[model samples]
Target: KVNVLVVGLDNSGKTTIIERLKGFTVDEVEKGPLTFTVFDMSGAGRYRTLWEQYYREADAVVFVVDSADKLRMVVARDEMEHMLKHSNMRKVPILYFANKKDLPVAMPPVEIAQALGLDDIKDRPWQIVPSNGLTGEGVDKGIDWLAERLS
Candidate 1:
């Protein structure tokens, strides 16, 4: 089984993605016949500490960022910088979802990447995708990329 960790600050996309994946099945997300075990870590302040429990076992990680919210971007960057460097984390693949791109105030995905300092992650594989998890836009494509990595 492929284990993926999906996290974000509140309302960034974690809730939407988790709801979307409940019954939705993906055929190409795994090599042959397989299931994608995703841990949708809640971004609630109370639940943040629990997040540490899953990253150690995740084959990959997805960080959903709400681009229209400046506070969330900084929160995302601070947490990610600490997350990607944890002792339990290896050269894991990270997919950053710059969600809510359809909004007028949302920053571009490229700008989001720069703010998140994605360029500094030299030891890992990561990508910033413009997405609207609310509409299931870039979410699937991100998973397809993840499938290839697992394969």
Candidate 2:
């Protein structure tokens, strides 16, 4: 069984993405396949406290970011850095979902990657998938890409 950690700033659609991956509506709760465990850590400043407890054991991490909110990219990056430093799972594959990419002014995947200081982590197995949780676009591709890595 693979463990996946979903983390991002508040309203970045991390929880929504988790729901969609489980084939459920955002407003409804549904059971997911028992093969995987999903941990949703929403809001800012919560990762440091929980990283060791969860991320240290996770098979992969989904770092969800708001592509439309360039200002908060630093916050996301810092959180990721913290996770890398504190968690034992530093080498685990990270699948970054640039959520809200469908927005008119959304930053491109490359820009988001640069903002997150991903160059250092680029050599490792990872992917930056564009996503729009509201429209359900890019969600399946993100899940499939992540599943492929876990496999």
lDDT of each: 0.70, 0.71
What candidate 2 gets wrong by more than 4 Å, as runs, is 23-47
Maximum-lDDT candidate: 2
Q: Scored by Cα lDDT, where does model 1 land?
A: 0.70
TM-scores of the candidates in the order shown: 0.81, 0.81
> Which residue pairs of candidate 2 clash?
none
Task: Mark the regions of model 1 whose C-alpha exceeds 4 Å error after superposition.
Answer: 23-49
Per-residue alpha-carbon lDDT of candidate 2 for residues 97-140, written as tens digits (9 for 90 to 100): 89998889898988987899887885458888999888888888
Maximum-TM-score candidate: 2
Angstrom error of the Cα, residue 78, model 2: value is 0.5
- In the range 30-82, model 1's lDDT, one tens digit per residue, is 43443443433335345545566566767887788888999767777877766
